[PDB]
Amino acid sequence: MELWLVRHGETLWNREGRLLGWTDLPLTAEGEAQARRLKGAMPSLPAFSSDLLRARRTAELAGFSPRLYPELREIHFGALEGALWETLDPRYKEALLRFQGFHPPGGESLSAFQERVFRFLEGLKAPAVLFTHGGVVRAVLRALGEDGLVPPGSAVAVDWPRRVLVRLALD
């Protein structure tokens, strides 16, 4: 199934290097500029978006009127919400870097996050554009055997659950 996944534009915590999960921050001016650059680049397919502000604002500026689904949210970092990556305990750093065995206190495990994301993708019955988050794009790319790191405001298209089709980035 052809799916286009968009990583929302940047927020302040992107430049500050803080873990941003369910904390509802707004896009920065540059984040909005990144979102506007997506208009016309994405295919005119049905759109779905995480209900968090930064994601559906990206969808709006990109020219879409998506239906909101919390299932497309970034992973819930629990007690780690807002933590500076720099000072994160090595065990959490390793868990996130290797994308495995992540169990944040008061939050979502990577296993629960993956189940949530993949279950949502399984329910899609036609090609669609998904406005989401870095962790979600990473989960999909890594499940397809590729590094899931894509710039804020960029997109990737995949043939789920078989392969990556294209990684798109604009300046």
Side-chain angles (χ1 to χ4, degrees):
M1 185 73 75
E2 186 184 320
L3 298 178
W4 290 69
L5 295 94
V6 177
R7 176 179 180 184
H8 63 66
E10 60 151 54
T11 69
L12 289 177
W13 280 10
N14 176 60
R15 68 183 61 176
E16 286 182 45
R18 289 179 179 283
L19 294 183
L20 179 60
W22 289 10
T23 294
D24 201 37
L25 295 185
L27 293 176
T28 60
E30 179 56 43
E32 295 195 342
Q34 297 175 322
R36 294 194 192 81
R37 286 197 279 280
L38 286 171
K39 187 171 183 179
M42 296 292 93
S44 42
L45 302 172
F48 297 104
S49 174
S50 156
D51 60 320
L52 292 172
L53 180 62
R54 56 197 193 270
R56 71 186 200 252
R57 175 62 169 169
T58 293
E60 171 187 40
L61 290 169
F64 290 89
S65 184
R67 173 169 186 179
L68 307 182
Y69 279 100
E71 290 88 345
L72 285 171
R73 286 192 181 194
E74 176 57 81
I75 187 170
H76 181 197
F77 289 110
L80 301 184
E81 285 288 332
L84 277 172
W85 171 266
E86 184 194 318
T87 58
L88 199 62
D89 187 291
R91 67 179 141 178
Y92 290 133
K93 277 214 193 58
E94 160 176 78
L96 293 178
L97 286 177
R98 298 168 60 67
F99 212 70
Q100 62 171 82
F102 180 57
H103 298 278
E108 272 188 310
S109 65
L110 265 171
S111 60
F113 174 59
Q114 281 160 330
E115 184 71 21
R116 162 157 77 70
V117 171
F118 302 147
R119 243 183 209 194
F120 176 81
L121 297 184
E122 176 182 57
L124 295 173
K125 303 307 176 199
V129 176
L130 312 179
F131 287 91
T132 183
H133 306 259
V136 175
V137 175
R138 193 177 178 201
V140 172
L141 291 177
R142 293 184 73 79
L144 296 176
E146 292 181 38
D147 171 47
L149 292 167
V150 307
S154 69
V156 69
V158 306
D159 173 14
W160 185 252
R162 300 183 68 73
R163 61 160 288 182
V164 178
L165 297 170
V166 61
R167 296 200 188 188
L168 178 61
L170 290 178
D171 289 331

